[PDB]
Amino acid sequence: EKYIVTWDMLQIHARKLASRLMPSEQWKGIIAVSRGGLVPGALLARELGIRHVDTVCISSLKVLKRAEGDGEGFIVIDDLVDTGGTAVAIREMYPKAHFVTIFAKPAGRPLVDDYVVDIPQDTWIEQPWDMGVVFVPPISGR
Amino acid sequence: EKYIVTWDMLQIHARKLASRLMPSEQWKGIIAVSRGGLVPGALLARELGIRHVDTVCISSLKVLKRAEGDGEGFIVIDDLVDTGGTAVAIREMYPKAHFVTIFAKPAGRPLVDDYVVDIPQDTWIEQPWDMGVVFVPPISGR
Amino acid sequence: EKYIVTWDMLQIHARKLASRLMPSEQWKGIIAVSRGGLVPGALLARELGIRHVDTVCIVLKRAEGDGEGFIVIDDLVDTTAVAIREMYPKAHFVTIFAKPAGRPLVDDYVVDIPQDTWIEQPWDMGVVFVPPISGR
Amino acid sequence: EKYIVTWDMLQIHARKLASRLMPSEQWKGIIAVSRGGLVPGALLARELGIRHVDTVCIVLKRAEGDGEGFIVIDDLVDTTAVAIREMYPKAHFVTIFAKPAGRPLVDDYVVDIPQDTWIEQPWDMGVVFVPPISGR
Ligand SMILES: [Mg+2]
Ligand SMILES: [Mg+2]
Ligand SMILES: [Mg+2]
Ligand SMILES: [Mg+2]
């Protein structure tokens, strides 16, 4: 299937994830996995009152940029987790961080500490930053 | 739970329902149950190329306004179906129509011919026409 | 150049029109012009608590009467406004948008748009994948 | 009176800015000003295919260098723009919106808003139940 994630829905899932991260005081900062985790990370930062937001950039492996530390007291966030991605690398670099994602495919579940929505292994997900509102012809030309 | 239905999502569900109603040629018109079925009915009419759109109005029972006929060749649409509503009355008035809804609670499933999304019996659903985009304070005042 | 109307924006306009139509009690029902007026009509129905909503499809089908006590609504008015005007001579005719040529044909409208305006309504659109500007 | 910015509108503005920043190849990375510049930054990152995104939190945390080859982005610019200007003297400083007092502080921006403009960003909002205008 093709799972469409709209801006409003991503915000709903993010607020639900933020609620599970309370109390906010247990966190010192947030490390967003670029580029997928940037928007979810910004939403979490807004909800938790956290201003210390950093990034970790990894082309597949090549660490372009890395937030310092072991992730203790930090939340590391990405948009989706599955097998064959960068989840293992993230856990090795920040073994002390709380790793969360918005979405998770079956194979990615054991790689994160928490997530919001379950996605079937076979489902393609379209994120809002990759879409736009445009004219769509009607299904029937009647 | 509180199930939030955004405008974009309602449109996605509606297009998916329209796809199941193809070929369009098997339909002569659409009868929307007011007020819940008005928007879904307008979306279906746009997708199927149907311009003959009528309404059926029923305060709970009192038929304020009724589209004539027995529903043969017509699609009757409402937003949600459950027990204790007007589903039985609709089937009696237009026994020959194709009754569809976007959402269905377990108890309402056997009352309609087709629907798109399953909603738990205990879940409250907020439709987009009842909402708006407004300032929301952060979960944490940190 | 395209004048895009999103669901959120349409809803904001319909609510401005609703507040102008208060008190709701003065109305018997709403007649939506098919298909453009269906969504604006449903929005007014919700805001004004009006359960009696009918339609006019032009004449494939038409609501009874002369529109007395009724609000007739369409989405846009350029130059049907006349057919409605003569079919429901006693109705309060309103639209969300109005182009210069349609302004005198309605009793009220919310948004003024230029005559050459290329407007796209939200029911004709949708959220789809859009290739990035750079292929990098 | 409130100037509301929806996700859809912000995205349209970010894409206009992206097309102005082509070719993407001329850039090494993007430095987003926390937290306002995080979302506009992620949008530019996607449109320009830039994977190197860093942040400056003001100084709780700051990206290395003098901004050479980098795009520094914030959401709005009134009167930090100066701190950035001196921290990354060689960076291309851009914002989505700009109030009159902030205009000369940035190298480029997309939308001009009046100095008394009360702007609300989409990350501070959400879809919630809104009582109908009539209780009928
Ligand atoms: Mg990702
Ligand atoms: Mg209903
Ligand atoms: Mg029209
Ligand atoms: Mg800001």
Curated annotation (Swiss-Prot), chains A, B:
Biological classification of the source: Bacteria, Pseudomonadati, Pseudomonadota, Gammaproteobacteria, Enterobacterales
Binding site for guanine: 82, 125
Gene Ontology cellular-component terms listed: cytosol; plasma membrane; protein-containing complex
Positions of xanthine binding: 82, 125
Pathway(s) served: Purine metabolism; GMP biosynthesis via salvage pathway; GMP from guanine: step 1/1; Purine metabolism; XMP biosynthesis via salvage pathway; XMP from xanthine: step 1/1
Quaternary assembly: Homotetramer.
Pfam families documented for this protein: Pribosyltran
Native source organism of the sequence: Escherichia coli (strain K12)
Molecular function per GO: guanine phosphoribosyltransferase activity; guanosine tetraphosphate binding; hypoxanthine phosphoribosyltransferase activity; identical protein binding; magnesium ion binding; xanthine phosphoribosyltransferase activity
Activity regulation text: Inhibited by thioguanine, GMP and, to a lesser extent, by thioxanthine, azaxanthine and azaguanine. Highly inhibited by nucleoside phosphonates, which are product analogs.
Note: E.coli cells express two distinct 6-oxopurine PRTases, with very different specificities for hypoxanthine, guanine, and xanthine. Salvage enzymes allow a more energy efficient synthesis of purine nucleoside monophosphates compared with the de novo pathway. The kinetic analysis suggests that E.coli HPRT is mainly responsible for the synthesis of IMP and that XGPRT primarily salvages guanine and xanthine.
Membrane-protein topology: Peripheral membrane protein
Name of the featured protein: Xanthine-guanine phosphoribosyltransferase
Residues that hold 5-phospho-alpha-D-ribose 1-diphosphate according to the record: 35-36, 78-86
Cofactor or coenzyme needed: Mg(2+)
Documented EC number(s): 2.4.2.-, 2.4.2.22
Function summary: Purine salvage pathway enzyme that catalyzes the transfer of the ribosyl-5-phosphate group from 5-phospho-alpha-D-ribose 1-diphosphate (PRPP) to the N9 position of the 6-oxopurines guanine and xanthine to form the corresponding ribonucleotides GMP (guanosine 5'-monophosphate) and XMP (xanthosine 5'-monophosphate), with the release of PPi. To a lesser extent, also acts on hypoxanthine. Does not ribophosphorylate adenine.
Keywords: Cell inner membrane, Cell membrane, Glycosyltransferase, Magnesium, Membrane, Metal-binding, Purine salvage, Transferase
Gene that encodes it: gpt
Compartments (UniProt record): Cell inner membrane
Listed PANTHER family: XANTHINE PHOSPHORIBOSYLTRANSFERASE, XANTHINE-GUANINE PHOSPHORIBOSYLTRANSFERASE
UniProtKB/Swiss-Prot annotation, chains C, D:
Disulfide bridge partners, by residue number: none
Annotated positions binding GMP: 78-80, 118-119
Entry annotated with the keyword Transmembrane helix: no
Membrane-related topology note: Peripheral membrane protein
An annotated GO cellular component: cytosol
Activity: how regulated: Inhibited by thioguanine, GMP and, to a lesser extent, by thioxanthine, azaxanthine and azaguanine. Highly inhibited by nucleoside phosphonates, which are product analogs.
Chain residues that bind xanthine: 78, 119
InterPro entries reported for this sequence: PRibTrfase_dom, PRTase-like, Xanthine_Guanine_PRibTrfase
Keyword entries, A-Z: Cell inner membrane, Cell membrane, Glycosyltransferase, Magnesium, Membrane, Metal-binding, Purine salvage, Transferase
Catalytic activity reported: GMP + diphosphate = guanine + 5-phospho-alpha-D-ribose 1-diphosphate; XMP + diphosphate = xanthine + 5-phospho-alpha-D-ribose 1-diphosphate; IMP + diphosphate = hypoxanthine + 5-phospho-alpha-D-ribose 1-diphosphate
Chain sites annotated for binding 5-phospho-alpha-D-ribose 1-diphosphate: 35-36, 74-80
Example GO biological process: IMP salvage
The protein's annotated pathway: Purine metabolism; GMP biosynthesis via salvage pathway; GMP from guanine: step 1/1; Purine metabolism; XMP biosynthesis via salvage pathway; XMP from xanthine: step 1/1
Subcellular location, record wording: Cell inner membrane
MF terms in GO: guanine phosphoribosyltransferase activity; guanosine tetraphosphate binding; hypoxanthine phosphoribosyltransferase activity; identical protein binding; magnesium ion binding; xanthine phosphoribosyltransferase activity
Residues holding guanine: 78, 119
Cofactor: Mg(2+)
Similarity comment: Belongs to the purine/pyrimidine phosphoribosyltransferase family. XGPT subfamily.
Other comments on record: E.coli cells express two distinct 6-oxopurine PRTases, with very different specificities for hypoxanthine, guanine, and xanthine. Salvage enzymes allow a more energy efficient synthesis of purine nucleoside monophosphates compared with the de novo pathway. The kinetic analysis suggests that E.coli HPRT is mainly responsible for the synthesis of IMP and that XGPRT primarily salvages guanine and xanthine.
Function: Purine salvage pathway enzyme that catalyzes the transfer of the ribosyl-5-phosphate group from 5-phospho-alpha-D-ribose 1-diphosphate (PRPP) to the N9 position of the 6-oxopurines guanine and xanthine to form the corresponding ribonucleotides GMP (guanosine 5'-monophosphate) and XMP (xanthosine 5'-monophosphate), with the release of PPi. To a lesser extent, also acts on hypoxanthine. Does not ribophosphorylate adenine.
Subunit structure comment from the entry: Homotetramer.
Name this polypeptide is given: Xanthine-guanine phosphoribosyltransferase
Record organism: Escherichia coli (strain K12)
Gene transcribed to yield this protein: gpt
